[PDB]
Every structure is written in structure tokens, then in C-alpha cells.
Amino acid sequence: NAQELKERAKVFAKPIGASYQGILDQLDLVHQAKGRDQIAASFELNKKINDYIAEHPTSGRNQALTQLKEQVTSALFIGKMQVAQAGIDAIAQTRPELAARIFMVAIEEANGKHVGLTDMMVRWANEDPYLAPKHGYKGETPSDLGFDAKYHVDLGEHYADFKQWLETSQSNGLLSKATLDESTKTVHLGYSYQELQDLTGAESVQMAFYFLKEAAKKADPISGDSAEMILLKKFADQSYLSQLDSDRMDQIEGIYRSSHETDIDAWDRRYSGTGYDELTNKLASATGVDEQLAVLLDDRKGLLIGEVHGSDVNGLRFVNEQMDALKKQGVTVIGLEHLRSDLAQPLIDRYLATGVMSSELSAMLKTKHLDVTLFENARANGMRIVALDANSSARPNVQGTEHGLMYRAGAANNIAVEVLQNLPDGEKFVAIYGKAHLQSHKGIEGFVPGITHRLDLPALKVSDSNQFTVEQDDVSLRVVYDDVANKPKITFKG
Amino acid sequence: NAQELKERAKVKPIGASYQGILDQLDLVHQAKGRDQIAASFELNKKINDYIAEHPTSGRNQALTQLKEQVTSALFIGKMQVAQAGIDAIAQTRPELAARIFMVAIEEANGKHVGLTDMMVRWANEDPYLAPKHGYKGETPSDLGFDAKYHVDLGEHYADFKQWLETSQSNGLLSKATLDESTKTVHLGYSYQELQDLTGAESVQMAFYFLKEAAKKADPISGDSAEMILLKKFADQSYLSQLDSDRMDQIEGIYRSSHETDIDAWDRRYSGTGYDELTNKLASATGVDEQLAVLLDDRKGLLIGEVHGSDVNGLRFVNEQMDALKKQGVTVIGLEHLRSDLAQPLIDRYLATGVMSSELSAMLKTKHLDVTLFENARANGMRIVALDANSSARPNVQGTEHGLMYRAGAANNIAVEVLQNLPDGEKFVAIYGKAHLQSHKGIEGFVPGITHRLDLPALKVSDSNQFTVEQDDVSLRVVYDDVANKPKITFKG
Ligand SMILES: [Cl-]
């Protein structure tokens, strides 16, 4: 095994190829590496073998390589693990890092833990466009930058116009994390595609972002890829792509456990039509704004107000107008899905502390149509404003299905619940979120429980006259999509 | 024998000092306009410095004749009266003296009597116009902005870099690049601009270490942190621009104190006019009733203020803004902000909707309400700054002529901006009480903003009612200090 292909390679029948010699070096890495690194290098070994065999269909090496690949694949998938061999190998032949992570989850699932998680990941790995094969910009990136780069775009002839709008933005405090290079006519961005989309409120960024997209689309017109995908697949930084794949799976692996560990029975026992709190007629009977808030906050962590994206703005209105009323009940936090916690959270914390609103923050507030008065009043009353969403929740477009909505629902809820549960002891919250997230939602392995089930609170909805109404959960949505059905599911026997 | 020195010393080796005089002499003949005058004073400076350092050289007599010729060539006839004054300034700083000269040339003919004495005396009296070399060295041209300072932080580079990057992360202090090689900072903001951004903790700290670096760089001299930055770290371009603007203000204050028709104003705003005007606001007690008469065939109105605790001016315009729009108000004047850096940021905010991090910082620094700007943009109103760094209050030892400067220099910024507005659009400016009424001067007396714009000095109370404040006539006089001194007057 170890001392097999060593002496045979020395017999110079033909000069050793650069790619083939690399296979021997990759094989040395497997025997030396330990833990899951060994497994990651093992899938990489088979990937290098496929590329050699495909590029050299008829060579004397092939027979030795097929035995190696057979011996490597057989060494990884043993016994119960053979059920997930076909699915993980398929992914491993392209993304060995992603396949290696699924392999670790399979080892644990083979020992009785987290049933169906491996299938969900294997199915989602090829079903999610963000986890598709991608290399990005792989060149000599600059290390002296004052920030972590996300894109290394080459604008070509668009460099002229982009520079104008980038310099105009930086002059007004916008797009700080961005440095140019006229020698190569490339830009080194420190902002995600979604982050730049959030700053579009400012004309300066809108134009800078416009030429960035046009530069990408012009650089790859043959593929149907959109402006966003071209930047990831061809101009993204290796470190950003490495974390992006990790963050996407963190949500999937997070949506799974949320869909199985949530005590949904007790939520129905408390807030259903036949709930013991009988919250439906209590807030209806009790008149006044402050009385309704009392019943909605007694013995509770906080409250969750709905928002129909069509034209409802009562959530953001009530919290801004009736902030003093809410302060009486003891709420020192205001949650919103409108802002991303990745870039907006630190800027909000700095604003509430100092009192000076940063340019990037002011830009986000115009894009998301959030009034500046909400933040002025919040800082005055001594309150927090937390972003209950992140870039991780980016809704993908699964072709021919409705699975994209499932990810958005669960991914965003994970981020929203994570922040609300880690608040200081005693401080209650008043989060405004979409109506779709407050009630149940269809999944691909059980069903995505709404943010209400997660926090043990009811789904509320404020009227134009400040009257709270309990919105019953739609039980019909507690099922998997019809396109999931009872297809070939990777299931172990232990 | 003006060009005889070209081959006298040439036909021991010529030193760099004497060669500098020869090179400077050739520059005088080649240069023209005011540059020739500036080069002439610079020539006499080199001659003075050569003789002062080499008092025992055969070239002194040759250079002494050259100094006579140049000095006698500049100050001819009636112009000789301003020789002793302008020459004293010339040996220390010729560019400043060159500007005074141009003004003095035309004064000899009859225009602006006493402006030369004002400038000549203010050149030495104003600490900002003192000699200042600034930074002598390499100036990077790829900074992307006009650098105002090139401070060298010895043991404070570590702490400054911390708050600078913390500022840039929040969109503050973008125009400032570091050089770890020399441990210097190519700062693109002025001293007052950083003071106006003190509201933000990020800047305040960086501004604190910026001073400490300067204080330790020159601890022996009893100069303030600000002056040390000018005298040893300011960019040559910024120093030339600073001295220019300071003299423009003095020259601008003279015009105001001699061209403003104070009689026409005083007759219809204080004497019979006050009694008749006071009855309008007294009788008509409505909110719109008062604004109608105060804007009756007028450019606008001016509300006074006392920085102690009175903030009715800022509070009134923010609240009843719609009421002001009915009579014809559009522009909203404001002393608190300074046009130099704030005006472009305001024009952006009102247009694009996104507030600049630096603007937001300024608003908190000057304790301005943010909703004033929000309501302005929504109602389609403009906000302009009626102040600048040009009106930098100077500390003149043993006298109160420093108060005179800001009183007049600030009004020039206010008046020039308020007058140059679209035809038909009225304005509502909030300013200090001192600036609305008359103030003491050095040549004459600095007239307030009310006299120049032909408006009254109003002051809104807590119950929203305009009360006309009488102009203090006692202040319409020159200081007892400057009066009856060596006056520099020309022949008719
Ligand atoms: Cl500039």
C-alpha cells in the first residue's frame, strides 16, 4: 500500500507527467494526514485520478490507478457506509471538501445519530446553486490590504467608470473596504454581492455596483450565469468561497436539528385554537394599546409581529410610534429581518453608542425604507436594534422546484432565533418579521418550524388602529413538498 | 549696475547663498505681474540673510547697492510712505508683503484710504499671519486629495493608527493616508475641520494623539497645539491658501465697514421705523401673521442666539417649517456648520438621501438636531452654512482685536452666501446675537449682518413671537487701543 507505487514509478518507461507525479504527492499526504483531513485528501486523490484517466484514456498507468481508486473508495465506505457511497462519491469527484464534510456526518449517522441528515445534505449539495462547482479568482492576491477580500474582479474597460463611482463613494464614506490596482485594472472588494445590493440606496454605490455587474456579464456571456454567479464562479476569493460553502451547510445542518428538536406539540398546547393561554379572547377583551402588550408579554420572552411584504408596514410603524408604550412592559430590544447582521449590526452598535450614523448604515436604511427616526428614538430611549438576518439566508433558485423557499425560511429563522435567545437575561424583545416565517413552512426533511415555535411565542399581527391579533399557525404547511416524496433516500441500518 | 553682478563674482567659487541671489535676480526679470513683486521681496530677503550670516565679505557692498535699487524700484514717490511697514513684513515673509503692496499701489492713487495701514498692522498683529515654514520635504502626488498636514508621530503612531482605522471603518477621516516607513500621516483635513468632527469618538481620539505628537515635537516653544501644526507640519499649499484667505477677510471687512449704507438702515429699522414695525408684531399675534409682515418686500429674516442655553432659533425653524414655506422661504441659514467641508456633504444628503458619516458627526458635534435635516429634505428645502475656517478667531495679546476679526470675517461668509441665492427665494438664518448688531472695529466699525442685508435683528421666544432687538449704538466705534497711532496715509 505505502511501499507499492514508489519503486514502480522510478522505472522510467516514460518521463513522469506533472499531474501524475502530483498523484504520488497527494498519496503521501493521505498516509501522513490524520482525522477528517485524511478523508478530505482521500476524495481529492480520487479527483486527481479521474482527471488523469479522463485526460489520458489509454495509458499504462490507468490499470494501477483504477486499483488505487478502488482501494481508496473501498477503504472509506465500509459496511453501513456503503449506502451513501454513490451520493457522496458523485459530489467528491468535483467538490472533495464538501463531500468530506458530508462523509463525517455519515459516520455519525451510521451510529444511530441524526437520521436522514446525510440524504438531505447529499440532495442539497447538487440542488443548491451556491454549492455548485466553482474556482473563482486563483492568483497572487495582495496581503497588505486592511480588510479581508471577497472578490478580485478584473473590470477591463469598465475600470474607468467604476473608478469614478468608487472614488465618489469612498469620498462620502461608502464602500470603504475596496482598493484598486490600475496595473491589472482589478478591484479588491470586501463586500458580498448581497451587501452591495443593500447599499444600493446611495446613487454612488448603485452606479459602482452597476459597472461591477456589467464587467462580470461581459467577461462570461457564453454561460447562462447571472451577474451574481459570474462573480462567485470566476472572480471570488478562495477564502470567501471556502467559508460560503461552510455557511450554507451550517444552515442546512442547522435547519435539520431545528426541525427535529423543536417541541411543536407544546406550542399547539399553548397557542392553538384550543390553547391553554386562551390568548385569542384575552387581548380582544382587554381594550387599549398598553393593556394588550401586558397580556402579550407576561411570562413571555417577548413578542413577534407579522409583516405582509405586499404593503403592510404596521410592524415597523407600531415599534417606532408606540416605543414608549413598549418600554413600559420592559422591552429593550427591537428585531428586524430588513437588515443583515453581517455588516449592519456593528454599524448599529456603534451608532447607538456614539450617536454618529455611519454612511453605510444610512445607505442601508434608505434601501430597506427604514426611517431614521426609528434609530433616533431607539437611541434616545436607550434601546437595542438587532438584525435578525444574515447573508447566509440568501434564497437560492432550485430549478423546476419550490425548494428555494424552504432554505430562505429555515436559514433566516436560525439566524433570527440565534440572536433572540442569546440576549441578556431580563431584556425582552419586539421583533418584526415576515408572516411566512412566523407560521410553519414546508421542508425537505420534516418541516421548517416557524420562528414562533422556536421561541415559544405566538404569531401576532397589528392593525392600523394598534390592535393585536393572534394569527393561528397554518397546520397544512407541516409537510414535505410533493416533489420530495419517497424517492431513493440514503438510510443506514443502525 | 543691476546686471553687473552676473559676471562680477564669476570672473573664489560662488557659494550656494550668493548663487541663490543670482538665480532669484534672474527670476525677477523673467517673472511678471504680482509674481515679480513677490520675487523682488524674496530677493531682498536672500540679500538680508546673506549679509546677516556673512557680514565680513566683499560681496556685501555689491549686495547693499542691489538692495537699495530693488527697494527704491518698488517704493517710488507717494508709495514711499508704506515702505517702512511693508519692508518689515517683506524680510520675514515676502508673499504676504507682496499682497499688501498691490493693495497699497492703488491706495496711492486714491482708492480705499487706510486699508494699507489696516493690512500692514494686521499682518504682524494676527498670530496666524506669522512666519511659518511648515513641512519641507517630499510631498506624495498620488494621495488623491490636497494634503493640509504632514505630521510625524514619533511614539504616537501606534495609538493614532488605531483610531484612524476605526474612523475610516465608519466612513470618517477618509482623506488621510499613512506612511509606516516615515511614521508620518498625510492628513487631508484642517485643524478646525477635525475640531468640528470631535462629536465622533473615533475622530476625537485620533485628533488628541495628533496634538500630542506636535506638542512633543516642539515642547520648548510656548505655542498651542494648533500653531505647531502650521509652523512645522502644514503643507506649503495649505499655508499659502490660509494666509491668502485671512487677508481676503481683512480686505473684505474694510469694504463692509466703508460701503454699507448704515444711515438708510438705521432710519427705517430703529428710529421711526422701529416704532412702526413693533406695532405689526404686537397687533398681529398669529404665527403666519408675524412672518407675513417680517417678509413684506424683504430678502428674509434673521434670528439671534446665545450659545449659553438659548436654542429657540434652531428649534423654531425645525418645528414651523411649513409655515415659513408659505411666505416664500427655501434656504435655511446656519452659523453652527462651516461651508469648507459641510456644504458639499449637505448638498449630497439633500439630493441622494444618504447622510455622510462626516456630516452626521458634525451635526452631533455642534449639537444640531438631525430631524431638522430630515424635514428639510422632505419639504424640498435647502440648508447652507454661514461660516468657514477663514473666520478663525485669533488670539491677539493685550487687546480685543481678535473679537473684531470673527465678528467681521464670519459676516462676510454669511452675507456673501445669503445674497447669492435664486431670484425670489427668501431665507431664514439663525446666528449669534453679536453678529446681528454692530460691533467695534479697527479701521471703522464692523457692521452686522442686518445692516448689509437690510434686515432687522429678530429673536423668537418660547411662545413663538418675534421681538426686534435694538442695535447697540455704543459699539459703532473704533477701539481706544488702535485710535490715535502711527497711521500710514498717502498723498492726494
Ligand atoms: Cl481634495
Inter-chain residue contact B201 with A354, CB threshold 8 Å = yes
Q: In chain A, what residues touch B358 (CB-CB under 8 Å)?
A: 173
CB B224 within 8 A of CB B96: no
End-to-end CA distance of chain B: 34
CA distance B180 to chain A (A): 12
Locate B268 and state its grid cell.
427705517
Q: What are the C-alpha distances in Å from B406 to residues A343, B124, B196, B393?
A: 44, 17, 17, 5
Give 3-state DSSP helix, strand, coil % of chain A, rounded to 5: 55, 10, 35
For residue B305, what are the contacts with CB-CB under 8 A and spacing of at least 6?
Answer: B311, B312, B313, B314, B335, B430, B431, B432, B433
CA of B413 to the centre of ligand 1 (A): 21
Q: If phi over 0 gives left and psi between -120 and 50 gives alpha, with beta otherwise, what is residue A483?
A: alpha
Say which residues have a Cβ less than 8 Å from residue B116's Cβ, sequence separation at least 6: B82, B85, B100, B103, B104, B107, B488, B490
Contact criterion met (CB below 8 Å) for A25 and A6: no
- CA A171 to ligand 1 centroid distance, Å: 10
B357 CA to chain A: closest CA distance, Å?
4
Q: Within 10 Å of residue A262's Cβ, how many Cβ atoms?
A: 19
State the distance from the centre of ligand 1 to the C-alpha of A195, rounded, in angstroms: 28
Residues with CB under 5 A from ligand 1 (ion): B 145-146
A171 touches chain B (CB under 8 A): yes
- C-alpha gyration radius of chain A: 27
Check CB contact of B167 with chain A, cutoff 8 Å.
no
Count CB-CB contacts under 10 A for residue A385: 21
> Which residues in chain B are contacts of A366 at CB distance < 8 A?
353-354
Q: Is B345 on the interface with A (CB under 8 A)?
A: yes
The answer to whether the CB atoms of B171 and A171 lie below 8 A apart is no
Task: Work out whether the CA dihedral B338, B340, B341, B347 comes out positive or negative.
Answer: positive
Chain breaks in chain A (C to N over 2.5 A) after: none
The strand ranges marked E within A162-320 are 178-181, 186-189, 302-305
Distance CA A257, CA A253 (A): 7
Q: For residue B439, give the amino acid letter.
A: H
Cβ separation B354–A202 shorter than 8 A: yes
Q: Are B275 and B404 in contact (CB under 8 A)?
A: no
B170 contact residues in A (CB cutoff 8 A): 173, 347, 350, 356, 358
Distance from CA of B178 to the nearest CA of A (A): 12
Q: Any residues with CB less than 8 A from the CB of A24 and at least 6 apart, and which?
A: A5, A6, A9
How far apart are the C-alpha atoms of B202 and B195, rounded to whole Å?
12
Residue of A nearest to B161 (CA): A146
Rounded Cα distance, A464 and A468, in Å = 10
What is each CA distance from A349 to A177, A407, A416, B156, in whole angstroms? 19, 28, 17, 28
User: Given an 8 Å threshold on Cβ–Cβ distance, is B370 in contact with A362?
Assistant: no
Q: Which residues of A398-430 are buried (b: 16+ CB within 10 A; e: fewer)?
A: beeeebbbbbbbbbbbbbbbebbeebeeeebbb
Residue A55, helix vs strand vs coil: helix
Contact B89/B82 with Cβ under 8 angstroms? no
Q: From the list A146, A173, A355, which residue is nearest B357 (CB)?
A: A173
* Chain B interface mutation, best of A148, A168, A172, highest count of B Cβ atoms under 10 Å: A172
Describe the strand order of the beta sheet including B184-187 as a list of residue ranges.
B151-152, B184-187, B176-179
Q: Provide the β-strand partners of residue A462.
A: A468
Picking from A260, A261, A277, the residue whose alpha carbon sits closest to that of residue A269 is A277
Which residues are within 8 A (CB) of A270 and not within 5 positions of it... i.e. 6 or more apart? A276, A277, A456
Whether the CB of B402 is below 8 Å from some CB of chain A: the reply is no
B186 pairs with which residues across the strands? B177
From chain A, the residues in CB contact with B175 under 8 A are 171
User: Residue A103 CA to chain centroid, in angstroms?
Assistant: 21
Question: Residue A170 and residue B174: Cβ atoms within 8 Å?
Answer: yes
What DSSP string runs through A243-288? HHHHHHHHHHHHHHHHHHHS-HHHHHHHHSTT-TT-HHHHHHHS-S
For residue A468, give the H/E element and its range: strand A468-470
Task: Give residue B398's region: left, alpha or beta (phi > 0; psi -120 to 50).
Answer: left
Hey, is the C-beta of B23 within 8 angstroms of any chain A C-beta?
no
**Hey, is the C-beta of A362 within 8 angstroms of any chain B C-beta?**
yes
**Phi, psi dihedral angles at B152 (to 5 degrees):** -110, 105
Picking from B355, B363, B374 by the largest number of A CB atoms within 10 A of its own CB, the best residue to mutate is: B355
Smallest Cα–Cα separation from A393: which of A358, A417, A421, A363? A417
The residue among B68, B75, B26, B78 whose CA lies nearest residue B47 is B68
The grid coordinates of residue B212 equal 500630542
Question: B199 to chain A: which residues are within 8 Å by CB?
Answer: 355-356
Q: Do B200 and A176 touch (CB under 8 A)?
A: no
If you measure from the C-alpha of residue B290 to the centroid of ligand 1, how many angstroms do you get, rounded to a whole number? 44
Decide if A358 and B353 are in contact by the 8 Å CB cutoff.
no
Check B202 against A354: CB less than 8 A apart: yes
DSSP string, B250-300: HHHHHHHHHHS-HHHHHIIIIISHHHHHHHHHHH--SHHHHHHHHTTTSSE
CB contact under 8 A, A350 and B170: yes
Q: For residue B145, how far is its CA from the centre of ligand 1 (angstroms)? A: 4
Q: Which three cell numbers stand for residue B482?
A: 488702535
Only one residue has cell 473666520, namely B391
**E runs forming strands in A261-416:** 302-305, 331-336, 384-387
Fill in the amino acid letter for A106. Answer: A
Q: What is the resolution of this structure in A?
A: 3.5
Element (H, E) at A372: helix A372-380
Residue of A nearest to B176 (CA): A171
Q: DSSP string covering B428-440, please?
A: EEE--HHHHS---
Residue type, B278: T
Tell me the CA–centroid distance for residue B146 and ligand 1, in Å: 4
Interface-testing mutation among B146, B161, B168, B170, with chain A (most A C-beta atoms within 10 A): B170
CB distance from A169 to chain B under 8 Å?
A: no
Question: Could you give the CA distance from residue A238 to residue A246 in angstroms, rounded to a whole number?
Answer: 13
Closest residue by Cα to residue A27 from A75, A68, A55: A68
Q: Are A249 and A98 in contact (CB under 8 A)?
A: yes
Chain A within 8 Å of B342 (Cβ-Cβ)? no
Q: Which residues contact B201 (CB under 8 A, 6 or more apart)?
A: A354
Residue B79 per-residue DSSP state: G
- Which of A176, A354, A356 lies nearest to residue B168, judging by beta carbons? A176
Distance B430 CA to ligand 1 centre (A): 29
User: Separation of A433 CA from ligand 1 center, angstroms?
Assistant: 44
Pairing mode of beta strands B329-334, B426-430: parallel
Exposure string (b/e) for B186-205, b if CB count within 10 Å is 16 or more? bbbbbbbbbbbbbbbbbbbb
A123 and A116 Cβ atoms separated by less than 8 Å: no
Residue B202 in contact with partner chain A when CB distance is under 8 A: yes
Q: CB–CB of B115/B103 below 8 Å?
A: yes
The single-letter code of the amino acid at B340 is: D
DSSP β-bridge partners for residue A468: A462
Beta bridge partners of B384: B333
Q: How far apart are the first and last CA of chain A?
A: 31
Closest-CA residue in chain A for B369? A376
Q: How far apart are CA A462 and CA A419, in angstroms?
A: 23
Listed residue (A209, A218, A127, A131) closest to A168, CA to CA:
A209
Q: Which residues in chain B touch residue A203, judged by CB atoms under 8 angstroms apart?
A: 352
Backbone φ and ψ of A485, nearest 5°: 50, -150
CB contact under 8 A, B170 and A363: no
Residue type, A368: K
